[PDB]
Design a protein around this ligand. Structure first.
Ligand SMILES: Cc1cc2nc3c(=O)[nH]c(=O)nc-3n(C[C@H](O)[C@H](O)[C@H](O)COP(=O)(O)OP(=O)(O)OC[C@H]3O[C@@H](n4cnc5c(N)ncnc54)[C@H](O)[C@@H]3O)c2cc1C
Length: 450
DNA sequence: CGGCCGCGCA
DNA sequence: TGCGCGAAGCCGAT
């Protein structure tokens, strides 16, 4: 079950005498992981062990206790899963560019393998690691069903050009996973404690000093991810087609935090949803979201390295937004007023409070939320900066290609078309308070989140 | 040339 | 709550 098009050489070299090392980064799971499975196969043909290495950087300081604890509790459970497969795991601290190089030398590695991410910083680390090693280095796309570089060889302007190219390749690339074969040939607790202490003075607090974040909505880890997948199929999938854009209903999958950390495979989710007997419109709507919209977000970041900037917007949108730079805004809020939910719009404020208290804003209100940031900020650049700052600080699923592609759709028209013409926002598709009012029970959502 | 919200009306 | 239109630009299959 090993298609060669899932893997490519980052660097050629002379293979070594030691273990195959899988540098895990994006795909924090033992099951349904093409990068670990390929590493295990290479190790088996060479008659040597496989081992896993993960580098804990100082990036955590830029987000919060909420993401750091979600990731680390998962990693504690993963450490135990890999051990039942007699696969050892090593947890390094510091800059990957230096630390993965040094580990490959200190540990006498034969081959290095990593998983795939289109984000800049991963590419920076790979470049540094390449400069400091002499062994072969491969990349495996463990996150997408169709490998990103195979689905398309260029940036796609719309879902409607990407969709036929991806779907033509599903009969080949959508397949079951083989079982991971076991090997035959300081603590994370201390790291968690130290990290939580370092972040404690910047934690999200109410006026009484009691924390805003509520950790009981999504329990972390590979076993919990699977339980959420299974309850989506049993209890929420049937009504997904009708209710996915109603934020007063809990009818989304709730999978995004697990998908973001790679605690569950999207290919796995697609296999199970394809085989579920349920509402045909719901299945089609859901599969289009997890296949086309998710995988087109990797396409966007992979072929546009300025993906978090105004430069990445399409020309029609840059030309429209530029012409409206001098328009008076109805309101202007600072980062801190947006963050504390202190606008004049109670629907906007409630969306921000759902984000602060749960770490997961409903998908429909994320669109509305980001578009009002544009409408009530000094400039398009300040808008993009504020939405990215709050998305990445407070979403459990943030710092993700879906986030940059979703924010760029909302603010800059990426994967959209010119739609209407207004002051400030020009031809960027508009969404209104009264528009929401006639689609769902706006007052119920506001009451639920203060 | 084909084909991707808010308002009015059941 | 569901459906069709309005007011509309651009990429890519020809
Ligand atoms: C302004 C804005 C910011 C966003 N930020 C993020 C983010 O930081 N991280 C993130 O994962 N998603 C982001 N999204 C996309 C989307 O809103 C979330 O993925 C979704 O709400 C997660 O909830 P769910 O898994 O229950 O969704 P479901 O409806 O159950 O969908 C299942 C999966 O399909 C994919 N998906 C759904 N919608 C989109 C979309 N619009 N674009 C790309 N993939 C999609 C996701 O992988 C998602 O988990 C953002 C969208 C917008 C408009």
């Amino acid at each position: 079950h090993m298609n060669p098009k899932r893997i490519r050489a980052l660097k050629s070299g002379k293979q070594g005498d030691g273990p195959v090392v899988y540098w895990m980064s994006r795909d924090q799971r033992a099951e349904d992981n093409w990068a670990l499975l390929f590493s295990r196969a290479i190790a088996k043909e060479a008659n040597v062990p496989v081992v896993v290495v993960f580098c804990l950087t100082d990036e955590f300081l830029e987000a919060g206790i909420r993401q750091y604890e979600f990731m680390l509790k998962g990693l504690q459970e993963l450490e135990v899963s890999l051990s039942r497969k007699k696969i050892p795991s090593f947890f390094l601290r510091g800059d990957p560019g230096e630390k993965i190089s040094r580990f490959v030398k200190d540990y006498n590695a034969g081959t290095l393998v990593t998983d795939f991410s289109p984000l800049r910083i991963k590419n920076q680390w790979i470049e540094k690691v390449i400069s400091g090693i002499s062994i072969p280095f491969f990349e495996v796309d463990a996150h997408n069903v169709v490998p990103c570089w195979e689905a398309s060889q260029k940036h796609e302007y719309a879902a409607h050009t990407f969709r036929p190219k991806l779907y033509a390749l599903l009969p080949e690339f959508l397949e079951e996973f083989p079982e991971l074969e076991p090997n035959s040939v300081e603590t994370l607790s201390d790291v968690l404690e130290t990290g939580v202490k370092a972040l404690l003075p910047e934690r999200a607090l109410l006026k009484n000093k009691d924390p805003l974040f509520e950790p009981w909505h999504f329990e972390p880890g590979e076993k919990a991810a699977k339980k959420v997948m299974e309850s989506f199929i049993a209890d929420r999938l049937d009504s997904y087609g009708a209710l996915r854009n109603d934020p007063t209903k809990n009818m989304l999958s709730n999978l995004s935090p697990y998908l973001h950390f790679g605690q569950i495979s999207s290919q796995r989710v697609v296999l199970e949803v394809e085989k579920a007997e349920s509402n045909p419109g719901s299945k089609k709507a859901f599969l289009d979201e997890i296949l086309i919209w998710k995988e087109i977000s990797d396409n966007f970041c992979y072929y546009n390295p300025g993906y978090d900037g105004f430069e990445s917007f399409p020309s029609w949108a840059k030309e429209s937004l530029n012409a409206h730079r001098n328009d008076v805004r109805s309101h202007i809020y600072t980062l801190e007023e947006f963050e504390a939910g202190k606008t004049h719009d109670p629907l906007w404020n409630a969306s921000q409070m759902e984000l602060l208290s749960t770490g997961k804003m409903h998908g429909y209100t994320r669109m509305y939320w980001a578009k009002k940031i544009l409408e009530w900020s000094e400039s398009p650049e300040k808008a993009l900066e504020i939405a990215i700052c709050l998305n990445d600080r407070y979403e459990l699923d943030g710092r993700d290609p879906n986030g940059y592609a979703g924010i760029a759709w909302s603010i800059g028209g990426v994967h959209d078309r010119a739609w209407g013409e207004r002051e400030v926002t020009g031809k960027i598709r508009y969404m209104s308070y009264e528009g929401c009012k006639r689609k769902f029970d706006v007052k119920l959502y506001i009451e639920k989140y203060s």
